[PDB]
Design a protein around this motif. Structure first.
Motif, PDB file in Angstrom:
ATOM      1  N   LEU A  52       0.711  -1.053   0.032  1.00  0.00           N
ATOM      2  CA  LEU A  52      -0.020   0.030   0.200  1.00  0.00           C
ATOM      3  C   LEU A  52       0.851   1.220   0.023  1.00  0.00           C
ATOM      4  O   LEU A  52       0.700   2.306  -0.934  1.00  0.00           O
ATOM      5  N   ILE A  55       3.038   1.423  -3.398  1.00  0.00           N
ATOM      6  CA  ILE A  55       2.238   1.886  -4.832  1.00  0.00           C
ATOM      7  C   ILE A  55       2.071   3.623  -4.624  1.00  0.00           C
ATOM      8  O   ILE A  55       2.061   4.250  -5.523  1.00  0.00           O
ATOM      9  N   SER A  56       1.665   4.004  -3.499  1.00  0.00           N
ATOM     10  CA  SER A  56       1.757   5.444  -3.365  1.00  0.00           C
ATOM     11  C   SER A  56       3.240   6.266  -3.562  1.00  0.00           C
ATOM     12  O   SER A  56       2.920   7.230  -4.298  1.00  0.00           O
ATOM     13  N   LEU A  59       3.368   6.283  -7.501  1.00  0.00           N
ATOM     14  CA  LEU A  59       2.551   7.417  -8.019  1.00  0.00           C
ATOM     15  C   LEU A  59       3.315   8.799  -7.788  1.00  0.00           C
ATOM     16  O   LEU A  59       3.147   9.778  -8.511  1.00  0.00           O
ATOM     17  N   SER A  63       3.917  11.104 -10.889  1.00  0.00           N
ATOM     18  CA  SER A  63       3.492  12.435 -11.168  1.00  0.00           C
ATOM     19  C   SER A  63       4.286  13.452 -11.167  1.00  0.00           C
ATOM     20  O   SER A  63       3.913  14.714 -11.183  1.00  0.00           O
ATOM     21  N   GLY A  64       5.569  13.367 -10.728  1.00  0.00           N
ATOM     22  CA  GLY A  64       6.619  14.418 -10.674  1.00  0.00           C
ATOM     23  C   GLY A  64       6.536  15.152  -9.408  1.00  0.00           C
ATOM     24  O   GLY A  64       7.422  15.997  -9.036  1.00  0.00           O
ATOM     25  N   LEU A  65       5.604  14.683  -8.551  1.00  0.00           N
ATOM     26  CA  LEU A  65       5.464  15.260  -7.148  1.00  0.00           C
ATOM     27  C   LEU A  65       6.429  15.067  -6.215  1.00  0.00           C
ATOM     28  O   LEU A  65       6.933  16.245  -5.549  1.00  0.00           O
TER      29      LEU A  65
ATOM     30  N   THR B 128      -1.549  10.496   1.448  1.00  0.00           N
ATOM     31  CA  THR B 128      -2.082  10.295   0.219  1.00  0.00           C
ATOM     32  C   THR B 128      -2.998  11.077  -0.127  1.00  0.00           C
ATOM     33  O   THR B 128      -3.182  11.847  -1.399  1.00  0.00           O
ATOM     34  N   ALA B 131      -1.066  14.185  -0.667  1.00  0.00           N
ATOM     35  CA  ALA B 131      -0.569  13.895  -2.359  1.00  0.00           C
ATOM     36  C   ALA B 131      -1.571  14.376  -3.377  1.00  0.00           C
ATOM     37  O   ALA B 131      -1.338  15.033  -4.470  1.00  0.00           O
ATOM     38  N   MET B 134      -1.964  17.877  -3.859  1.00  0.00           N
ATOM     39  CA  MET B 134      -0.624  18.626  -4.194  1.00  0.00           C
ATOM     40  C   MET B 134      -0.365  18.602  -5.720  1.00  0.00           C
ATOM     41  O   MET B 134       0.642  19.039  -6.468  1.00  0.00           O
ATOM     42  N   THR B 135      -1.036  17.408  -6.238  1.00  0.00           N
ATOM     43  CA  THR B 135      -0.346  16.960  -7.510  1.00  0.00           C
ATOM     44  C   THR B 135      -1.051  17.823  -8.689  1.00  0.00           C
ATOM     45  O   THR B 135      -2.317  17.935  -8.733  1.00  0.00           O
ATOM     46  N   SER B 137       0.473  17.694 -12.046  1.00  0.00           N
ATOM     47  CA  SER B 137       0.985  17.245 -13.527  1.00  0.00           C
ATOM     48  C   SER B 137      -0.360  16.670 -14.053  1.00  0.00           C
ATOM     49  O   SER B 137      -0.518  16.807 -15.429  1.00  0.00           O
ATOM     50  N   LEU B 140      -5.490  12.205 -13.673  1.00  0.00           N
ATOM     51  CA  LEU B 140      -5.414  11.074 -13.161  1.00  0.00           C
ATOM     52  C   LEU B 140      -4.777  10.609 -12.085  1.00  0.00           C
ATOM     53  O   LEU B 140      -5.311   9.851 -11.380  1.00  0.00           O
ATOM     54  N   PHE B 141      -3.642  11.291 -11.780  1.00  0.00           N
ATOM     55  CA  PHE B 141      -2.837  11.157 -10.473  1.00  0.00           C
ATOM     56  C   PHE B 141      -3.314  11.373  -9.192  1.00  0.00           C
ATOM     57  O   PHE B 141      -3.401  11.100  -8.343  1.00  0.00           O
ATOM     58  N   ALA B 144      -6.113   8.869  -8.603  1.00  0.00           N
ATOM     59  CA  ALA B 144      -5.217   7.862  -8.025  1.00  0.00           C
ATOM     60  C   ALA B 144      -4.818   7.890  -6.470  1.00  0.00           C
ATOM     61  O   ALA B 144      -4.932   6.943  -5.717  1.00  0.00           O
ATOM     62  N   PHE B 145      -4.403   9.018  -6.328  1.00  0.00           N
ATOM     63  CA  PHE B 145      -4.013   9.163  -4.990  1.00  0.00           C
ATOM     64  C   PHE B 145      -5.259   9.150  -3.939  1.00  0.00           C
ATOM     65  O   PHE B 145      -5.342   8.549  -2.842  1.00  0.00           O
ATOM     66  N   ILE B 148      -6.074   5.579  -3.538  1.00  0.00           N
ATOM     67  CA  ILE B 148      -5.124   4.602  -2.296  1.00  0.00           C
ATOM     68  C   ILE B 148      -5.568   5.262  -0.891  1.00  0.00           C
ATOM     69  O   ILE B 148      -5.615   4.523  -0.020  1.00  0.00           O
TER      70      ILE B 148
END
Ligand SMILES: *C/C=C(C)/C=C/C=C(C)/C=C/C1=C(C)CCCC1(C)C
Ligand SMILES: *C/C=C(C)/C=C/C=C(C)/C=C/C1=C(C)CCCC1(C)C
Ligand SMILES: *C/C=C(C)/C=C/C=C(C)/C=C/C1=C(C)CCCC1(C)C
Ligand SMILES: CCCCCCCCO[C@@H]1O[C@H](CO)[C@@H](O)[C@H](O)[C@H]1O
Ligand SMILES: CCCCCCCCO[C@@H]1O[C@H](CO)[C@@H](O)[C@H](O)[C@H]1O
Ligand SMILES: CCCCCCCCO[C@@H]1O[C@H](CO)[C@@H](O)[C@H](O)[C@H]1O
Ligand SMILES: [Cl-]
Ligand SMILES: [Cl-]
Ligand SMILES: [Cl-]
Ligand SMILES: [Cl-]
Ligand SMILES: [Cl-]
Ligand SMILES: [Cl-]
Lengths: 242, 242, 242
Positions: A52, A55-56, A59, A63-65, B128, B131, B134-135, B137, B140-141, B144-145, B148
C-alpha cells in the motif's frame, strides 16, 4: 535516443511497480480471507501495508510530485550539473520500512522497547539518506549524511541478528524469521550500494534510468516477495504463530 | 461581494474552530481534575491532545503558513486556474486522527499490534490525501492518490468494526465503543465526500469558503463532540474502565 | 568584524556539537559492550539514538540544508528584516526528544498509553515551535504558536512529575529517575527561554550567533550529559533494572 532511452528506462522502472504493488495488494487481500483472527491476522495487516505504501510512492514519483533536480557540488563527478533525484523513494521508505520491521516484530514477538528503538533507527536511516541526496553546499556533507545513515542501518541490522532472533527462538518462529531476516539483510544492503555506485553517490553509473531500475528491482524482493513468503508461511503455520 | 463573501466565509470557518478548540481544551482540562489515575486518566490524556492539535491546525491555516495556491491540471473543472488549498488540514490530520484512534484504542483495550497497524494506515490515508491535493501534473494522478487514500481508510474502518469491537466486548466497553465507533465512521466518511464534491475534486461546489466550512463542521463533531462524549462516559464509568 | 564575529560564533557553535555528539556516540557504544541483554540493553539502545539524531541535526545546520532566512513581521523588534533561522533544530527535536522520553520511559517502566500520549505531546511541542519560527504574516500568530507549544510542553512535564514518577517508584528506579527528571525539566525549560529572549522571539538578544550557542550548550546537557549519567547508572544497577 539517449534521452528517449533514459526516459524509457525511467518510466518503465516506475510503472512496473505500480502494477506489481497493485497486484500484490490484490493477492494479499485474497490470502487474508483464510487467515484466523489473532496474531496471524495482525501480521497479515501489517504486511498488507507494505505494498500500500509502495504503490503510493511510485505514484508520487510518476506524477512528478516527489522528483526534483539537484545541483551537484564541486568535486562530484557531475559537479555543476542538475541531476534528477527520486527523493520520493527516501521519503516513503520512512513509512514502508517500519511496516516491514513491524511485520517481522510481530512474527518474532519482540520486546516493544526493542521495536520502538529499531523503528526509530530505521526512520533516522531514511531521513539522513534523504538529507544526503538533498545536500548541495558541499560534497563532504553529502557523504557525512551517508555515513550517519549507515550507522542507523547498523543499529537496525544488529537488532535483527541478535535480540529479534533471540525473541523468535523463544516464540517458536526462529526458522521462518531466519529466512526472512537473511532476505532482509541481503536486499537492504543493496540500497546503499545503489546509492554509492549510482548517480547521487560516486556516479560510477551515471544513468538515473539505470539507478531507478536498480531500486525498483530491490523493492520487488524486499517488499513484494518478502511479504508473499511471510503470508504463505503464516497461513500454513497459524497455530505456531497464535 | 463574491470576494468579500468568499473571504468572509473562509475567515469565519477558521476562527470559529480556534474558539471552539480553545474552549474544548479548557473544558476537557477541567473535567480531568475529577478523573482517577490509571486507564481513565490515560484516555483523558490522549483525548485532550485532539483539540490541542486541532487549534494548532487552524492557526496554521489562519496565518497563511499552511495554505497555498495550486494550479488545476487539464480536465479539471477549473483547469488552468489556481485554487486556494488548505493543505494544512491534511497535514495535521496525520497527527490528530492518530490521537482519536489512540483514545478509542485505550477505551477498547485493543491489541498493540492492531493499534500500530491502524495508526500507520491512518497516516497513509492522510499523506496520500495530501498528495492528491498537491498533485498538478495530471488529473489521473490526483484521483489515483484519492483511491489509495480510500484503501487506507478502509483498513482503518475494517479494524474498527471487527477487531476493535471484539476487544471492546471483552474489555466491557462495547456499548460506549459502539456509539463512538458509529459516530467516527459516519463523520469520517464526510471528509472524502467533501473532497470529491468540493473544489479540489469534482468541484460540484466551487466555493473554497463553502468547502472549508464543511470541513470545519465535520471537525466540531469528529473531534470536539466525540471527545466530550468520551470524557463524559469515562468520568461516569471509571471502574468499568479501570 | 561583527560579521566575522557573528559568523565565527555560528560555525563554532555548530562544529562543537558535531564533535561532542560524535564522541558521545563512540563512548556510548563502548559502554554498551558491558551491558547485559534485557531491559538494561533496551535503555542503552534508546539512549544511543539521542546523539545519533543530534549529530545529524548539526550536519543539517552546517550544510545549509536546514537553515533559512525569515522576514520578521510588523511589530517585531526586527520588523522588515530577514533573520537567520536554524529551523533544523526544531525539526530534529521532533525525533531526538522522543528518544530521550523513550529512555526515561524504559527506565521508569511507564504505561504504554502514557508513553504514546507523552511522545505525541512532545512532537506537537516541536512542530508548533517550528510553526512559530516559520510564521511571517503576523506577530500575533508567532506567539500564539509559542503558547500552544508551551501547552504541549506542560502535558509532557505533568506526565513526568506524576505518572512517570509513580511508575519509577514501583519499578524501583525512583531515585535515578528523579535525578534525570529534574535534569530534564530544568534544561528543557531553557529552550523556550532562549526562543523568547533570542532573535526569533523578543530579540532582547539580537545575535543569532549567541542564540545558537545557547541552544548548543543546552544540548550538551539535555542530551550528552543526561545520557552519560543514565548509562553510568544502568551499567551499575543492571539487576535493579532487569
Ligand atoms: C522498501 C524499501 C526498502 C527496503 C529500502 C531500504 C533502504 C535502505 C536500507 C537504505 C539505506 C541507505 C543507507 C544505509 C545509506 C544512505 C543511503 C541509503 C538511504 C540508500
Ligand atoms: C479531525 C480530522 C478528521 C477526523 C479527518 C478525517 C479525514 C479523513 C477521513 C479523510 C479522508 C480522505 C479520503 C478517505 C480520500 C482522500 C481525501 C481525504 C484525505 C479527504
Ligand atoms: C535535545 C533537544 C531538546 C531537549 C530540545 C527541547 C526543546 C524544547 C523543550 C522547546 C520548547 C519550546 C517551547 C516550549 C515553546 C516554543 C519554542 C520551543 C520550541 C523552543
Ligand atoms: C562508499 C565508500 C566510498 C565513498 C567515497 C568517499 C567520497 C568520495 O566522493 C566522490 O569523489 C569522486 C571524485 O574523486 C567523485 O567521483 C564522486 O562523485 C564523489 O562522490
Ligand atoms: C468520487 C467518484 C468519482 C470520481 C471522479 C473520477 C475522476 C473524474 O475527474 C473529474 O472529471 C470532471 C470532468 O468530467 C471534472 O469536472 C472534475 O474536476 C474532475 O475531477
Ligand atoms: C514570553 C512572554 C512575553 C511574550 C511577549 C508577548 C508578545 C510580544 O511580542 C514582541 O513585542 C515587542 C515589541 O513590543 C518586540 O520587541 C518583539 O520582537 C515581539 O516579539
Ligand atoms: Cl516505499
Ligand atoms: Cl523519475
Ligand atoms: Cl487537525
Ligand atoms: Cl484558507
Ligand atoms: Cl536534535
Ligand atoms: Cl546557522
Amino acid at each position: 535516443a539517449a534521452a528517449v532511452r533514459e526516459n524509457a528506462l525511467l518510466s518503465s522502472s516506475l510503472w512496473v511497480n505500480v502494477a506489481l504493488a497493485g497486484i500484490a495488494i490484490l493477492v494479499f487481500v485474497y490470502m487474508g480471507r483464510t487467515i484466523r483472527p489473532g496474531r496471524p491476522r495482525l501480521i497479515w495487516g501489517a504486511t498488507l501495508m507494505i505494498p500500500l505504501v509502495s504503490i503510493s510512492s511510485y505514484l508520487g514519483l510518476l506524477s512528478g510530485l516527489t522528483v526534483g533536480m539537484i545541483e551537484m557540488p564541486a568535486g562530484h563527478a557531475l559537479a555543476g550539473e542538475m541531476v534528477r533525484s527520486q527523493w520520493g523513494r527516501y521519503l516513503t521508505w520512512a513509512l514502508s520500512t517500519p511496516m516491514i520491521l513491524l511485520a517481522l516484530g510481530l512474527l518474532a514477538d519482540v520486546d516493544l522497547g526493542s521495536l520502538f528503538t529499531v523503528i526509530a533507527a530505521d526512520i533516522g536511516m531514511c531521513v539522513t539518506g534523504l538529507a544526503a541526496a538533498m545536500t548541495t553546499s558541499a560534497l563532504l556533507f553529502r557523504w557525512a549524511f551517508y555515513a550517519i545513515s549507515c550507522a542507523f542501518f547498523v543499529v537496525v541490522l544488529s537488532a535483527l541478528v541478535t535480540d529479534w532472533a533471540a525473541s523468535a527462538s523463544s516464540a517458536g518462529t526462529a526458522e521462518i524469521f531466519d529466512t526472512l531476516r537473511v532476505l532482509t539483510v541481503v536486499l537492504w544492503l543493496g540500497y546503499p550500494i545503489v546509492w554509492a555506485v549510482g548517480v547521487e553517490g560516486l556516479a560510477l553509473v551515471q544513468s538515473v534510468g539505470v539507478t531507478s531500475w536498480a531500486y525498483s528491482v530491490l523493492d520487488v524482493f524486499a517488499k513484494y516477495v518478502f511479504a508473499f513468503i511471510l503470508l504463505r508461511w503464516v497461513a500454513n503455520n497459524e497455530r505456531t504463530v497464535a
